[PDB]
């Protein structure tokens, strides 16, 4: 499922990401651009072989399990594919660890690379929720 801008703020909002560990809902709704484009099926190899997926780009290195990432792990108890889903639970829980792990949203590239900094309330302007 490819999310609308307001649609997703209001998904990720009653999932309670909205201020979660201290990053305000503009945040999110920027990295999920950045990352996937809001797109719920969104793939993408990296060089080590692992494989980032979903709206957020979890990586099977680490949280979730693909089946073909040798020595990885699987941090957020989940099979990669339930990433991939229209219904974004999954990858809101998997994320909320993921922030907490100590580096916080600096785990998301785009996220550091693209929002961080920038004036993120605009993504949820005009919004109702
Ligand atoms: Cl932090
Ligand atoms: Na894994």
């Given at each position: 499922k490819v999310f609308g801008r307001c649609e997703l703020a209001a998904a990720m909002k009653r999932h309670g990401?909205?201020?979660?560990?201290?990053?305000?809902?503009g945040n999110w709704v920027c990295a999920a651009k950045f990352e996937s484009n809001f797109n719920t099926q969104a793939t993408n190899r990296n060089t080590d072989g692992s494989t980032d997926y979903g709206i957020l780009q979890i990586n099977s290195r680490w949280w979730c399990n693909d089946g073909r990432t040798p020595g990885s792990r699987n941090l957020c108890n989940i099979p990669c594919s339930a990433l991939l889903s229209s219904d974004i639970t999954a990858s809101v829980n998997c994320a909320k660890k993921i922030v907490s792990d100590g580096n916080g949203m600096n785990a998301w590239v785009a996220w550091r690379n693209r929002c961080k900094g920038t004036d993120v309330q605009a993504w949820i302007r005009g919004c109702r929720l």
């Open positions: 990401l909205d201020n979660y560990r201290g990053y305000s809902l």
